[PDB]
Write a protein that holds these residues in place. Structure first.
Motif, PDB file in Angstrom:
ATOM      1  N   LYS C 177     -14.322  36.296  -8.454  1.00 51.46           N
ATOM      2  CA  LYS C 177     -15.064  35.604  -7.250  1.00 51.46           C
ATOM      3  C   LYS C 177     -13.738  35.286  -6.172  1.00 51.46           C
ATOM      4  N   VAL C 178     -15.317  35.743  -4.443  1.00 52.54           N
ATOM      5  CA  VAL C 178     -14.176  36.223  -3.953  1.00 52.54           C
ATOM      6  C   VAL C 178     -13.866  34.491  -2.809  1.00 52.54           C
ATOM      7  CG1 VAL C 178     -13.656  37.065  -1.392  1.00 52.54           C
ATOM      8  CG2 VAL C 178     -14.517  38.291  -3.800  1.00 52.54           C
ATOM      9  N   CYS C 179     -12.721  33.669  -2.615  1.00 52.14           N
ATOM     10  CA  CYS C 179     -13.443  32.739  -1.631  1.00 52.14           C
ATOM     11  C   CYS C 179     -12.754  32.634   0.164  1.00 52.14           C
ATOM     12  CB  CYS C 179     -12.158  31.915  -1.681  1.00 52.14           C
ATOM     13  SG  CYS C 179     -11.679  30.310  -1.302  1.00 52.14           S
ATOM     14  N   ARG C 180     -13.768  32.259   1.277  1.00 49.50           N
ATOM     15  CA  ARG C 180     -13.505  32.409   2.019  1.00 49.50           C
ATOM     16  C   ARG C 180     -13.634  31.664   3.184  1.00 49.50           C
ATOM     17  N   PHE C 181     -12.230  31.475   4.079  1.00 49.82           N
ATOM     18  CA  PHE C 181     -11.965  30.301   4.590  1.00 49.82           C
ATOM     19  C   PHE C 181     -12.431  30.540   6.014  1.00 49.82           C
ATOM     20  N   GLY C 182     -13.244  30.500   6.282  1.00 49.93           N
ATOM     21  CA  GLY C 182     -14.165  30.664   7.953  1.00 49.93           C
ATOM     22  C   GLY C 182     -14.933  32.189   7.412  1.00 49.93           C
ATOM     23  N   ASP C 183     -15.768  32.202   8.276  1.00 52.66           N
ATOM     24  CA  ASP C 183     -16.728  33.511   8.895  1.00 52.66           C
ATOM     25  C   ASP C 183     -15.284  34.788   9.149  1.00 52.66           C
ATOM     26  N   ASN C 184     -16.344  36.038   9.738  1.00 53.46           N
ATOM     27  CA  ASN C 184     -15.476  37.691   9.964  1.00 53.46           C
ATOM     28  C   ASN C 184     -15.534  37.057  11.125  1.00 53.46           C
ATOM     29  N   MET C 185     -14.669  37.504  12.077  1.00 50.34           N
ATOM     30  CA  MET C 185     -13.942  37.569  13.435  1.00 50.34           C
ATOM     31  C   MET C 185     -15.487  37.875  14.006  1.00 50.34           C
ATOM     32  SD  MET C 185     -11.965  40.088  15.916  1.00 50.34           S
ATOM     33  CE  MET C 185     -10.837  40.766  14.680  1.00 50.34           C
ATOM     34  N   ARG C 186     -15.494  37.022  15.163  1.00 46.41           N
ATOM     35  CA  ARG C 186     -17.168  37.902  16.192  1.00 46.41           C
ATOM     36  C   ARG C 186     -17.298  38.723  16.755  1.00 46.41           C
ATOM     37  N   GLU C 187     -18.315  39.085  16.514  1.00 46.23           N
ATOM     38  CA  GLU C 187     -19.074  40.367  16.953  1.00 46.23           C
ATOM     39  C   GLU C 187     -18.825  42.022  15.956  1.00 46.23           C
ATOM     40  OE1 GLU C 187     -20.189  40.994  20.646  1.00 46.23           O
ATOM     41  OE2 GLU C 187     -21.232  38.582  20.505  1.00 46.23           O
ATOM     42  N   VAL C 188     -18.086  41.802  15.067  1.00 48.11           N
ATOM     43  CA  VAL C 188     -17.441  42.779  14.402  1.00 48.11           C
ATOM     44  C   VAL C 188     -18.070  43.603  13.243  1.00 48.11           C
ATOM     45  CG1 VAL C 188     -15.207  43.868  12.915  1.00 48.11           C
ATOM     46  CG2 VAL C 188     -14.707  42.017  14.299  1.00 48.11           C
ATOM     47  N   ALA C 189     -18.480  44.998  13.383  1.00 45.08           N
ATOM     48  CA  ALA C 189     -19.547  45.174  12.551  1.00 45.08           C
ATOM     49  C   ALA C 189     -19.027  45.965  10.739  1.00 45.08           C
ATOM     50  CB  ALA C 189     -20.209  46.515  12.922  1.00 45.08           C
ATOM     51  N   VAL C 190     -17.730  46.230  10.910  1.00 48.75           N
ATOM     52  CA  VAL C 190     -16.996  46.608   9.612  1.00 48.75           C
ATOM     53  C   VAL C 190     -17.304  45.587   8.333  1.00 48.75           C
ATOM     54  N   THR C 191     -16.496  43.747   8.697  1.00 50.69           N
ATOM     55  CA  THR C 191     -15.755  43.497   7.732  1.00 50.69           C
ATOM     56  C   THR C 191     -17.572  42.553   7.342  1.00 50.69           C
ATOM     57  N   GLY C 271     -10.872  28.932  -9.603  1.00 51.91           N
ATOM     58  CA  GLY C 271     -10.797  29.065  -9.961  1.00 51.91           C
ATOM     59  C   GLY C 271     -11.498  31.213  -9.468  1.00 51.91           C
ATOM     60  N   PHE C 272     -10.743  31.240  -8.254  1.00 54.76           N
ATOM     61  CA  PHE C 272     -10.597  31.976  -7.190  1.00 54.76           C
ATOM     62  C   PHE C 272     -10.139  33.926  -8.017  1.00 54.76           C
ATOM     63  CE2 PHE C 272     -12.749  28.916  -4.432  1.00 54.76           C
ATOM     64  CZ  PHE C 272     -13.588  28.977  -4.284  1.00 54.76           C
ATOM     65  N   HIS C 273     -10.132  34.781  -7.689  1.00 51.90           N
ATOM     66  CA  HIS C 273      -9.089  36.039  -7.538  1.00 51.90           C
ATOM     67  C   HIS C 273      -8.636  36.801  -6.703  1.00 51.90           C
ATOM     68  CE1 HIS C 273     -10.945  35.971 -12.149  1.00 51.90           C
ATOM     69  NE2 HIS C 273     -11.997  35.344 -11.419  1.00 51.90           N
ATOM     70  N   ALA C 274      -9.559  36.615  -5.444  1.00 45.52           N
ATOM     71  CA  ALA C 274      -9.386  37.215  -3.818  1.00 45.52           C
ATOM     72  C   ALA C 274     -10.035  36.013  -2.483  1.00 45.52           C
ATOM     73  CB  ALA C 274     -10.039  38.358  -4.001  1.00 45.52           C
ATOM     74  N   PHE C 275      -9.519  36.089  -1.570  1.00 49.35           N
ATOM     75  CA  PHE C 275      -9.769  35.381  -0.564  1.00 49.35           C
ATOM     76  C   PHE C 275      -9.360  36.074   1.119  1.00 49.35           C
ATOM     77  CE2 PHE C 275      -5.228  34.554   0.726  1.00 49.35           C
ATOM     78  CZ  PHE C 275      -4.575  34.891  -0.279  1.00 49.35           C
ATOM     79  N   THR C 276     -10.155  35.400   2.035  1.00 49.32           N
ATOM     80  CA  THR C 276      -9.736  35.472   3.584  1.00 49.32           C
ATOM     81  C   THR C 276      -9.475  33.943   4.187  1.00 49.32           C
ATOM     82  OG1 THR C 276     -11.821  35.639   3.663  1.00 49.32           O
ATOM     83  CG2 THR C 276     -10.853  37.903   3.463  1.00 49.32           C
ATOM     84  N   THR C 277      -9.015  34.446   5.088  1.00 48.11           N
ATOM     85  CA  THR C 277      -8.506  33.949   6.436  1.00 48.11           C
ATOM     86  C   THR C 277      -8.873  34.895   8.143  1.00 48.11           C
ATOM     87  OG1 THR C 277      -7.026  32.811   7.951  1.00 48.11           O
ATOM     88  CG2 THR C 277      -6.173  34.676   5.606  1.00 48.11           C
TER      89      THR C 277
END
Lengths: 498, 498, 498
Positions: C177-191, C271-277
């Protein structure tokens, strides 16, 4: 009593834990109502078991995981009650080897125009929860049948039931075992094919036991058990003179009874559901199985003539499919035609083995057998006419890279005159658009002289069967025109060639 | 003597009628010269017949039309002596049923620098004429072979003849009949498959006769004919004590002899070229054919183990294929391994049926027979060691939608210790990258426990075979590395997938 | 201790009931002996559980049904001790949702030349049994891994162990389970990409919680718990003057400690195993998480930068995959190049977040500098150099219709001079074939700047990871030549597209 009694369809409600303890208390209430009401008053093929609520991903996954393991679970029926974020269902629907039907329904039938408010809407809103779930099935490209209507809608019970019928057919076939006594008739194509492919796709098995293994069992049957069965022949059938005591072919009857009893013991002890025979290999047998095969077919075993395992399994499948329905279902081969302006007819039959299940009357049992084919004694057989009314003939063929199911809708008719010189039973039908187009379409579209004939099942049943197994259904019926028909063959060839 | 003597390859010269009657008189001169010299001094598998010159469209079509109709024509080898515009060949090539090779050759080896002029250049211009013909073959995606070299070049002869070999193999297979005495071993997958597909693709036929039919011909063989064959067993083989006259298992030797004669009379009258047996159906036979099958394999017939018609047909193909070569071509099964650092070995054998064409010695005909399998009396067989040297094992498999030919290069080795207790003949080899990698690639890449072993044919022969029939060849040799091996499987899957 | 110890690999033995009660006793004896010894002496990633013999179709299907149901069952290693007809395996392999490896082994290492007989060969016949099983996997086009070797071969252990790693990896990722704090950086295709496709394909879940939710938990952590962690920071790291008590940025060390505890409590309870900011959204946070992410990476959590859930996931997967191995495993980004003849190097880093698992010394922990990107206070962070030795850099990218795994073999190297003005931890390697070719190949082949660096794992593990998930492995290593590299990109494109 029925093999439907060994299966259940699970009733699974889709929604979300983020509603409320009370809201979800209310949906189980409806669910317990509708499921009970359906089990009591809907007359569905088998029982519906209400499973707990599918609210969270891990619970939905848990339901699917149990559903896979439970051999009585023949599929799920999911009522999308409120709004069940399809993302919860992903993990479950990914693992799920059991069929699914979305019942897109609503607790209330009319809209309560004057008492409708947000706390209603916030309970019972399948109108959009159903659709979110429809997407993920489409996106994942899974079968997922769909039936819309209020749960008390008699037409909706009908559609839901036929689906359950297919779901059960699907499970049974996974365990269906065919026993062959010898190999295919030499130089024949359509009855040949890849048994490995069939087991992969459909789950049925086909292996061959040597005619001698049968002959050993036939030769072990006691004279008492033999005689007992002849007493049941005397009570079930109209014995012709040669057939009665003191008749010239009396022994040919006892020999038939023996064979039937050997074939029975053999199939029971091997756990088999269908079998084949071959006239080119009957060393050790006194006559080709005739009467014997007819009675076994009536008792439920699938069968097809010359080593033809596909049809034999198909017969068994369709026999089980037809449980509780009114109608016959038999092995059948098109024997000859009657050409006449406005009355082109097809006489159906076989060497001997036609199932009494499709009969009208009480069947004569004769020999008048001299069956030159095979090189054996005069075989006993049941002669009879076939019941009148709408029917289908189906054939499953192996195109090498895939299977195709051809079903021609037909109408059986009374023979216009008696048939005194024909020592075998007969079916007589008008083929749907008309004989020329029916036959030409059948020939164009591959597909064989061996078929399964059924009064019990229909075009709608076979369509669901094809979808359930993801194979091409080729339909020949009153709406068939050849240009369109040909185009469909082509367009399907690229579609299913993927 | 050889079945190569019932086939010829057509030498067809391409040119164009616009050159002059005398330029054409000179290409014919060269062609008669070249062809005569090759039949006389090139030691090719079969004869070259120089056809008339292909100069106009109608002439080239007529040649193709004849080539099709002539059963002894195994293919064409075309020399483009001058430019012969490719459209002239289109209609001939669209009907051509026989394979074709371009011999990209020239009459002179060296360029006559001091005399070369336009006359010389208008005559002999294969350098560009041959390239125009390449186009059309590639444009029509026809499988045209090419060999480049001077017509006297002994390496070219080799490759030319190697092709003529596969051409003849291709025609013989169109007439190869397999007789099965019973069906596949139950529950077994690789041995199974689509006999219709095989016939369509390769042209060989597979049909089943009841063991009963065989049993009948086995029983009718006369005592004198039986003891006559035992006189050749005693002259050919070393007879163990139990095998000789007053030996405890003399009787079992006579019964093997009669099985052989029965099987040979049946196979000769049926016109069969290969056959199978199954130990799960030996009703009426005293013992499982062992010795009998081995001598029939040596006498030419294809054979495989448990109704395995593909491997049996393959054995016959590869036997015929190997005519006039270093011999040693057998049915084989990988029986067990020897694990040791730098000496991992495979022991090859089978129940009984190993062909003595690959033997060194002159072999023991023992009974020491208890063969539990099949449940019959004690089989007679031939025990022996396999010759040393480079070999291949080949397996043809049905992937359902297509065929795959697996070939593993190997190197047989003399056993380090005697095998006194092993009552069967044995091959022993090192598998060519190494045992783990060779076994893993073979396992990964489909394809099975039954094989055709051969000293007489090599990887380049099998490569041409696979080209000739447009099927994947999966090669396992010293250059095999797993990552790249796997990639090829993927990329070949999509290629041969249409 | 490990999460490998909540998983088990099933040792499943193929045979057939027709062999005899005693033969089957002996196989179970070998089985108990092999399995027992491997658990004791082989040092495998997790425990092998010997299941009952797979002897009949219904037993083998049972085993697969059970295998699927059991959460600790991570896969099956099957040993075909005896010939085990593969049609018995069909219905089970059709339902089997767990990965499989055939261990092509033998109980004895050396052939007993002087004692070997039919008896020995009735028992112990993997050499042929393994190949029939090979066929059915290949025919059903299932991924079946294979290892060949005597069961005491220590290299076989290594390779079988490696497979189990991927097996355990695959199960764990199902629950990731991945927990994201916010959405992807604006206008980036990769992520950016389809999070549903990912969950379907791999089974890990990505769902965004708002930063305001994290900010609540951060703000509720007591002063005593904050100070308790700064004690553990003082004892783990070399604190710079501004970090120590009385330091000008001492309050910045407490704010990082308070953020670290806010995330860890949030991740635990979620109960998260990975995350992003994402630095574009840090409303309510005093600084960008810097030291807090690095320590959580060390503690095993997955992490990537600006809303890069794919890489975050991949970090967790590869950390879990590497458990018990010796090596680092860090989130990484390709910061800059050094261009020199024979000394072309790539400096890896990020904004802040580099995992100390790949470090050498005890790291200094500073708030040395002003991070001017989307935020406020100077964040604390860990400054260190990377270990020396062979590593790999990987990245999973989404090509819209499928996924691709890019893997470049690299070699880390000590920094040729000190780095006094760089306030972030750094890696430094020499990319295989060479920097121009590796970077081109990496750019040509879709994928991106964010990557998972790892000493622990190697190319072989990534090849097995790619097979396990049926995705494209794109390898960049010393063997990489660009024309061939482009070719594969093409040939794979058609393979994996369809």
């Amino acid at each position: 009593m029925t093999i439907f009694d060994n299966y259940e369809v699970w009733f699974v409600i889709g929604s979300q834990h983020l509603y409320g303890p009370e809201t979800l208390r209310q949906v189980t209430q409806h669910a317990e109502h509708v499921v009970n009401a359906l089990n009591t008053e809907a007359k569905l093929p088998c029982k519906l078991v209400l499973k707990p609520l599918g609210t969270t991903p891990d619970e939905i996954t848990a339901i699917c995981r149990d559903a896979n393991y439970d051999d009585p679970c023949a599929g799920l029926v999911v009522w999308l009650h409120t709004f069940s974020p399809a993302k919860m269902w992903i993990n479950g629907l990914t693992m799920l080897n059991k069929p699914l039907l979305q019942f897109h329904t609503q607790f209330n039938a009319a809209l309560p125009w004057d008492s409708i408010d947000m706390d209603f809407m916030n309970l019972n809103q399948t109108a959009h929860g159903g659709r979110e779930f429809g997407f993920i099935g489409a996106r994942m490209r899974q079968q997922h049948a769909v039936v819309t209507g209020h749960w008390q809608d008699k037409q909706a019970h009908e559609r839901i039931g036929s689906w359950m019928r297919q779901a059960v057919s699907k499970q049974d076939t996974r365990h269906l075992k065919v026993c062959r006594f010898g190999d295919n008739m030499r130089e024949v194509a359509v009855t040949d094919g890849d048994k490995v492919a069939a087991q992969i796709k459909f789950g049925f098995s086909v292996n061959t036991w040597a005619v001698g293994d049968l002959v050993q069992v036939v030769n072990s049957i006691s004279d008492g058990d033999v005689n007992a069965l002849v007493d049941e022949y005397e009570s079930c059938y109209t014995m012709t003179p040669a057939t009665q005591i003191h008749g010239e072919k009396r022994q040919n009857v006892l020999e038939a009874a023996r064979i039937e009893l050997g074939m029975k013991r053999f199939l029971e002890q091997g756990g088999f559901h269908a079998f084949t025979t071959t006239f080119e290999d009957l060393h050790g047998l006194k006559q080709l199985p005739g009467l014997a095969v007819q009675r076994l077919m009536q008792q439920g075993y699938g069968f097809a003539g010359e080593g033809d395992w596909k049809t034999a399994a198909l017969l068994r499948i369709m026999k089980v499919m037809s449980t509780g329905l009114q109608g016959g279902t038999s092995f059948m081969e098109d024997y000859t035609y009657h050409f006449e302006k406005g009355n082109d007819l097809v006489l159906g039959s076989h060497m001997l083995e036609v199932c009494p299940s499709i009969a009208v009357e009480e069947k004569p049992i004769l020999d008048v057998q001299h069956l030159g084919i095979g090189g054996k004694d005069d075989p006993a057989r049941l002669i009879f006419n076939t019941q009148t009314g709408p029917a289908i003939v189906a054939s499953l063929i192996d195109l090498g890279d895939r299977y195709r199911l051809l079903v021609n809708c037909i109408d059986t008719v009374k023979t216009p005159h008696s048939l005194p010189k024909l020592p075998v039973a007969n079916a007589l039908w008008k083929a749907q658009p008309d004989l020329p187009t029916a036959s030409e379409a059948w020939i164009l579209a591959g597909g064989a002289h061996h078929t399964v004939f059924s009064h019990a099942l229909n075009l709608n049943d076979m369509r669901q069967f094809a979808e359930m197994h993801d194979i091409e259904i080729t339909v020949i019926d009153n709406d068939t025109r050849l240009p369109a028909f040909k185009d469909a063959l082509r367009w399907n060839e690229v579609y299913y060639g993927f």
